[PDB]
């Protein structure tokens, strides 16, 4: 079943509005609703906290403060704490300071605004330089990795390019907002939330309430979008909900209004990247030296892994004999940044990407050959390594880009464009090609495990359950498909159930594009046990050997006789053979050392390429993507439709990141862009007018679920091509380095134009 383009498991339900998300679930009439009241300072001591106006507000029932917290007060996904309710001082504008449970969402919102709070302000750190200045950082100092000796390499280099440039963050904007609900259930709680990580929600709620893990059960059936935004900031909602619940005696739900959501949660780490890169006379890179300043926010969240991944991707798609990264994870008084599709990767990649382009302009070379010339070697003595020392044995980049350029009519188009430009004085088109190599697996190694539990009922139908969470990316269907493929029956007999830490325990968050790779195995593992039992039984019964019992298309065949799967199961039931099983999986071959920067942190890499073409307006910088062509490698895809879709969506999101998406804070730290009316994701019409997406269809070298390949994050990096192209257009307008910053808003583009035009 694996391999066919079947629709998402809740397609119909989405499309008629029966699919329920969290705020849709029915709940008792006495359910309360909650809202945080937030700090209005970027950095201060809290000096007075009068809440009387709060308690007195209509419909309100309980109000909460760090002191009311019965046990832990900490939602951080990492060993250093992050209070859920402020403990004496605040650190960014948005930080929740107390919590309100009233008889209605509005009510709670309204009350949250009546507090009388006095602060003793303090100097605030809002910018990388400020941070740098004040040595405000995480991990007691920057992280440095080095392979070879760069300064040597670069001092003696025929060509060179130094450059510095800004990469702005990005707000997830998941259509369904953060949200959760908790229901006291004799002794313990049951939380429903919209999170990518129920096993953690469990852990944090448990600690928040002083309960052993077994007294807390998180169920989560679907999220309306997550993109990393829900890898951890689901914690504050769950904690508050469980805590209000334990106190008031009653169910408590909490959902952030959009404005709150954007102000409180984190975003993608914005980066400043400073690079020197250099090459040979023939164009082979000689070395690249990089410094990453990354804006993490006021607490650790997942900065640690994120910045590790960006370093880990600083080689972009190329082999480089010497390469250095110095990675500062700067602490600042603003939203605590966190995961976002790509998890650092795009930042590191775009780093190398910008440079190599700068390099190419420098030597009047065509960027594309320059790249193509430095891709890692194809597979099949001594294989090349990355700067962290992992052999790259499966890079099909050379082949693929070639194939893409042909199919995209790359060369010819390039000319048509030059011409067209030369005849225009107000508009310029530009086009670029960018590649992608992304590694698969958590860099924090022991997260790479998954479990599934499978049940077959006497009427032959099946209930599948696994650790992943469906956030729109088709995970469940793939897992259904794998299961139906391994048991030999039609998918229709397989039903998916909601994710539930009481059914599969100790899960990792659904992330690192590892949802399907791993859960897939786990389910397969369960289904294999089950199938095993069936064959054993059939065999003894029909005298003969298990391995000749065949399950296919809903039918079982043995010794010339054949029966319907149901008929087999019923009979195993009568025979008393267990029809239930768990299954589990752990990614092999991984080992690496973060501090040393050496090892094999990944199983295999994902690749792909994209050629985008755009036009810009020389007067105002207005601009847009006319056409894009992608060719991306999803292994032996488990579901081509489902994959094409992630590819298309990711691309858009990726581009979105480098074009109109822009975060802005005011001089006092306030988030100015905190609502769709001022934070602008790709709207329907920004879709490329011609959008060709196709897949490289080749098995994965490594032994993954049906030789497929993760496909959720990788494709997000194809967005770079858009930025690259945007920059090709500026370059066409003058002979200077456009030095286009990201995000490329029109103001930004217009600025690049002028530089290149030499008008300042």
Ligand X SMILES: Nc1nc2c(c(=O)[nH]1)N[C@H]1C(S)=C(S)[C@@H](COP(=O)(O)O)O[C@H]1N2
Q: Where do the DSSP E strands lie in 60-201?
A: 60-64, 89-90, 96-102, 116-121, 143-147, 159-167, 179-185, 188-193
74's CB contacts (< 8 A; 6+ apart) are 81, 82, 83, 84, 204, 207
Residues of this chain that bind a copy of itself (CB under 8 A): 13, 18-20, 26-30, 183, 186-188, 202-203, 206, 212-215, 251, 446, 448-449, 451, 453, 455-463, 465, 493-495, 497, 502-506, 573-576, 578-582, 584, 586
β partners of residue 60: 102
- Nearer CB in complex with a copy of itself: 213/737: 213
Of the pair 305, 472, the CB lying nearest ligand 141 is at 305
Residues 6 or more apart whose CB falls under 8 angstroms from that of 140 comprise none
Give the Cα separation of 446 and 508 in Å (integer). Answer: 9
Choose, by CB under 6 A, the member of 349, 512, 534, 652 that binds ligand X: 512
- 343 forms part of the interface with ligand 141 (CB under 6 A): yes
Q: What is the DSSP letter of 717?
A: G
Q: List the interface residues with ligand X, window 217-276 (CB under 6 A).
A: 225-228
Beta strands 494-496 and 462-466, pairing class: parallel
* Interface pick for Ca ion out of 91, 109, 137, 172 (rule CB under 5 A): 172
Q: What is the DSSP letter of 551?
A: E
Using the minimum distance from each CB to ligand 141, give the nearer residue, 94 or 344.
344
| Residue, CB closest to ligand 141 | 511
Active-site position among 622, 713, 747, 757: 713
Q: Does 343 bind ligand MOS (CB under 6 A)?
A: yes
Is 713 part of the annotated catalytic residue set? yes
User: Could you please report the per-residue DSSP string of 596-632?
Assistant: TTEEE--S-EEEEEEEEEEEEETTT--EEEEEEEEEE
Cα–Cα distance, 673 to 584 (Å, whole number)? 43
CB 283 within 8 A of CB 271: no
- Binder to Ca ion among 10, 265, 612, 628 (CB under 5 A)? 265
Q: Which is nearer to ligand 141, 346 or 362 (CB)?
A: 346
Nearest approach in angstroms of CB 176 to ligand MOS is 15
172 touches which of ligand MOS, Ca ion, ligand 141, none (CB within 5 to 8 A by kind)? Ca ion
Q: How far apart are CA 252 and CA 242, in angstroms?
A: 7
168 makes contact, choosing from ligand MOS, ligand X, ligand 141, none, with CB < 5 to 8 Å by partner type, with none
Please give the C-alpha separations between residue 634 and each of 313, 520, 653, 704, 714, in angstroms, as whole numbers.
19, 15, 18, 12, 9
- Smallest distance, Å, CB 344 to ligand 141? 8
Is residue 111 within 8 Å of 686, Cβ to Cβ?
Answer: no
Residues 659-718 binding ligand MOS (CB under 6 A) are 713
Strands 188-193 and 216-220, sheet pairing:
parallel
* Selected binder of ligand MOS within 511, 581, 611, 638 (CB under 6 A): 511
For the beta carbon of residue 129, count every other beta carbon within 10 angstroms.
Answer: 12
For residues 712 to 731, the per-residue mask of contacts with ligand 141, x marking binding by CB under 6 A and - elsewhere, is: -x------------------
d(CA 292, CA 320) in angstroms, rounded, equals 18
Separation of alpha carbons 103 and 569, rounded Å: 50
Are the CB atoms for 733 and 753 separated by under 8 Å? yes
By CB under 6 A, the residues from 702 to 721 that bind ligand X are 712-713
Residue 473 as a binder of ligand X (CB under 6 A): the answer is yes
Tell the smallest beta-carbon distance from residue 230 to Ca ion (Å). 8
| Least gap, CB of 339 to ligand X (angstroms) | 6
**229 is an interface residue for Ca ion by CB under 5 A:** yes
Find all residues with CB under 8 Å of 26, minimum gap 6, and list them.
none
Min CB(512)–ligand MOS separation in Å:
6
Of a copy of itself, ligand X, ligand MOS, none, which one sits near residue 503, judging by CB under 5 to 8 A according to partner kind?
A: a copy of itself
Cα atoms found within 13 Å of the Cα of residue 229, Cβ hemisphere only: 25
What whole-number distance in Å separates Cα of residue 404 and Cα of residue 417?
18
Among the residue ranges 31-39, 93-101, 505-513, 656-664, the one whose residues contact ligand X (CB under 6 A): 505-513
Residue tagged 């539990």 (tokens) = 453
Which two three-digit tokens encode residue 494?
A: 């397989």
Give whichever of 486 and 647 is closer to ligand X, judged by the CB atom: 647
Among 182, 254, 286, 339, binds ligand MOS (CB under 6 A): 339
Residue 174 in contact with ligand MOS, rule: CB under 6 A: no
What is the smallest separation between the CB atom of 486 and ligand 141, expressed in angstroms? 27
Which entry of ligand 141, ligand MOS, ligand X, none binds 443, CB below 5 to 8 A by partner kind? ligand 141
Structure tokens, 189: 């709680």
Calculate the CA 83 to chain-centre distance. 24
Q: Residues interacting with ligand 141, by CB under 6 A?
A: 228, 231, 302, 305, 309, 339, 343, 442-443, 509, 511-512, 713
Q: What residues line the site for ligand MOS (CB under 6 A)?
A: 196, 228, 231, 339-341, 343, 511, 713
């Amino acid at each position: 079943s694996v391999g066919k383009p079947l629709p998402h498991d809740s397609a119909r339900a989405h499309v008629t509005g029966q699919a329920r998300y969290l705020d849709d679930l029915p709940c008792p009439a006495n359910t309360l609703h909650l809202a945080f009241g937030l700090s209005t300072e970027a950095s201060a001591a809290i000096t007075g906290l009068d809440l009387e106006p709060v308690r007195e507000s209509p419909g309100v029932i309980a109000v909460f403060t760090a002191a009311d917290l019965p046990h832990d007060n900490d939602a951080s996904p990492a060993p250093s704490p992050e209070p859920v309710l402020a403990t004496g001082e605040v650190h960014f504008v948005g930080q929740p300071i107390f919590l309100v449970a009233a008889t209605s969402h509005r009510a709670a919102r309204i009350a949250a605004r009546k507090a009388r709070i006095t602060y003793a302000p303090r100097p605030a750190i809002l910018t990388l330089d400020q941070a740098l200045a004040a040595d405000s950082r995480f991990e007691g100092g920057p992280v440095i990795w080095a392979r070879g000796d760069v300064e040597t390499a670069l001092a003696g280099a025929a060509h060179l390019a130094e450059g510095c440039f800004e990469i702005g963050g990005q707000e997830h904007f998941y259509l369904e907002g953060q949200a959760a609900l908790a229901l006291p259930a004799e002794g313990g709680v049951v939380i429903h939330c919209s999170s990518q990580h129920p096993s953690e929600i469990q852990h944090k709620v448990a600690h928040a309430l002083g309960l052993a893990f077994h007294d807390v059960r998180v169920e989560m059936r679907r999220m309306g979008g997550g993109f990393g935004g829900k890898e951890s900031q689901g914690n504050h909602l769950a904690i508050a909900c469980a805590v209000a619940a334990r106190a008031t005696g009653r169910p408590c739900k909490m959902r952030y209004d959009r404005d709150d959501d954007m102000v409180i949660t984190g975003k993608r780490h914005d980066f400043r990247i400073r690079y020197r890169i250099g090459a040979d006379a023939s164009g082979k890179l000689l070395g690249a030296d990089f410094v990453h300043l990354a804006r993490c926010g006021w607490s650790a969240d997942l900065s640690l892994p994120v910045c590790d991944r960006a370093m880990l991707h600083a080689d972009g798609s190329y082999f480089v004999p010497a390469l250095r990264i110095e990675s500062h994870r700067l602490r600042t008084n603003t939203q605590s940044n966190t995961a976002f599709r790509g998890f650092g990767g795009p930042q590191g990649a775009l780093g190398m990407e910008r440079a190599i382009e700068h390099l190419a302009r420098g030597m009047g070379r065509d960027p594309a050959e320059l790249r193509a010339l430095n891709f890692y070697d194809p597979p099949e003595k001594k294989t090349q390594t990355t700067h962290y020392g992992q052999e790259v044995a499966d890079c099909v980049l050379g082949e693929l880009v070639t194939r893409l350029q042909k199919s995209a009519n790359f060369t010819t188009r390039r000319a048509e464009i030059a011409a067209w430009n030369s005849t225009n004085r107000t508009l310029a088109r530009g086009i670029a090609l960018s590649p992608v190599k992304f590694g698969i697996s958590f860099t924090l190694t022991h997260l790479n495990q998954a479990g599934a539990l499978v049940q077959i009922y006497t009427d032959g139908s099946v209930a599948l359950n696994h650790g992943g969470t469906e956030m729109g990316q088709g995970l469940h269907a793939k897992m259904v498909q794998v299961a139906a493929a391994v048991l030999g029956i039609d998918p229709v007999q397989v039903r998916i159930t909601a994710t539930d830490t009481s059914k599969v325990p100790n899960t990792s968050a659904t992330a690192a594009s590892s949802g399907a790779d791993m859960n897939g195995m786990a389910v397969k593992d369960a289904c294999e046990t089950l199938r095993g039992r069936l064959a054993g039984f059939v065999a003894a019964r029909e005298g003969c050997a298990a391995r000749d019992v065949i399950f296919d298309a809903g039918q079982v065949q043995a010794s010339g006789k054949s029966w319907r799967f149901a008929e087999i199961v019923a009979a195993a039931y009568m025979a008393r053979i267990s029809l239930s099983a768990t299954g589990f999986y752990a990614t092999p071959k991984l080992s690496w050392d973060r501090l040393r920067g050496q090892g094999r942190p990944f199983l295999y890499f994902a690749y792909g390429a994209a050629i985008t073409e755009v036009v810009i307006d020389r007067l105002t910088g207005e601009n847009r993507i006319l056409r894009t062509d992608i060719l991306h490698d999803a292994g032996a895809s488990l579901n081509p439709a489902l994959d094409i879709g992630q590819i298309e969506g990711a691309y858009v999101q990726g581009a979105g990141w480098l074009t109109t998406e822009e975060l802005v804070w005011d001089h006092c730290g306030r988030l100015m862009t905190h609502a769709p009316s001022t934070y602008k994701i790709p709207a329907f019409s920004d879709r490329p007018r011609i959008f060709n997406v196709a897949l490289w269809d080749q098995p994965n070298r490594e032994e993954t679920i049906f030789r497929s390949k993760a496909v959720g994050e990788p494709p997000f990096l194809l967005g770079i091509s858009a930025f690259l192209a945007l920059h090709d257009a500026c370059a066409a307008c003058g002979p200077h380095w456009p030095d286009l910053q990201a995000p490329a808003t029109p103001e930004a583009v217009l600025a690049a134009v002028r530089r290149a035009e030499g008008r300042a």
